[PDB]
C-alpha cells in the first residue's frame, strides 16, 4: 500500500500516451504525468547522444511496481528504457487512498 | 545542522493557479522555493473514465518539519477535490544550498 | 551494482544546462542527464518574489559518486549556490540499473 513514483522516458508523446493508457487500463499505475520538450544526454556505443524525449512520471504502489515496470518495458520501443522507482514518505490522505483504490 | 528537506509534487490546472499556489505557500514560509513546469499532460481514470488533462507540474522544496502544513495549505487553496500531493525524501544535497532552504523557512 | 540516485539541479539556461550535463558525463560522475527547459523558479530573495525562467535537470548516478557529482556540478555552475538535491532510487529495471552502474 506504500506509494512510489516511477520515472520513464519515451521518444515522443504518442508512444508515451498509449504507454500510459496501457498501464492505466491494466491498473498497474493510478496516474501518469507526461512532460514533453525534454532532452536527454548520455553515451551510447562510444558517442555522446542527445535525444528529444518525453519525461513520464507514474504513480503506483510497492505491490504493483514490478508488474508496472515489466509491462512498461515490454511495450516500450527501446530494449532497455529508463525505469526507476522513487519512494514516497508522505502524501495527502485522500489522494493516497484514491490512488490505492485505483490499482 | 540542517533539517532534512523534502521535495513535494503537485499539479495545477494552469499556470495562473500554479503561481497563486506557489506564492501562497512561499509567503506562508511553508516552502523555500517552487519550480513550475508547464506543458504537461496527466492521464488517469476518474470514476471509470480515462481523462487526459493539461497540467502544470509543481516541485516544491521545504523541510520535513513543514511538510504536513505545506500539504494542508496546498490542499485548502487548490481548486481540485483530490489534488496530487506527494512527498519525496532528499537524502543528500549541497550543504550550502540545504542551509539556504533551512534559512528561508 | 551500487545503489542509484537521482540528482536535481536547476540551470539558468539551456546552454548552461547542456554544458553542465556534457561535463559531468565526460567526467563519469553521471550516467545520464534529462533536461527540461521552460521551467519557472519562484522563491524569495531579500524581499523580492523572484521569478526566473530556468531549466530543470535530472541526473542519474550512484551513491558512491553523488558527492563528487555535486561538487563538480556546483563549481562548473555559474551560480554560487545552485539547487543540488539527491533523491534515492529504491528500485528499477535490472538491465537499466546495470547500465547506469556500468556507465560509471
From Swiss-Prot, chain C:
Obligatory cofactor(s): Cu cation
Keywords, in A-Z order: Copper, Cytoplasm, Metal-binding
One Gene Ontology term, aspect cellular component: protein-containing complex
An annotated GO BP: response to copper ion
Free-text comment on the cofactor: Binds 1 copper ion per subunit.
Superkingdom: Bacteria
Binding site for Cu cation: 9, 76-77
Cross-referenced SUPFAM superfamilies: GlnB-like
Cross-referenced Pfam families: CutA1 (PF03091)
InterPro entries named in the record: CutA_Enterobact (IPR023700), Ion_tolerance_CutA (IPR004323), N-reg_PII-like_a/b (IPR011322), N-reg_PII/ATP_PRibTrfase_C (IPR015867)
One Gene Ontology molecular-function label: metal ion binding
The UniProt record lists the keyword Metal-binding: yes
The keyword Kinase is assigned to this record: no
Gene3D superfamilies: 3.30.70.120
Localisation per UniProt entry: Cytoplasm
Function: Involved in resistance toward heavy metals.
Listed NCBIfam families: PRK10645.1
Family: Belongs to the CutA family.
Assembly, per entry: Homotrimer.
Name of this chain's protein: Divalent-cation tolerance protein CutA
Source organism: Escherichia coli (strain K12)
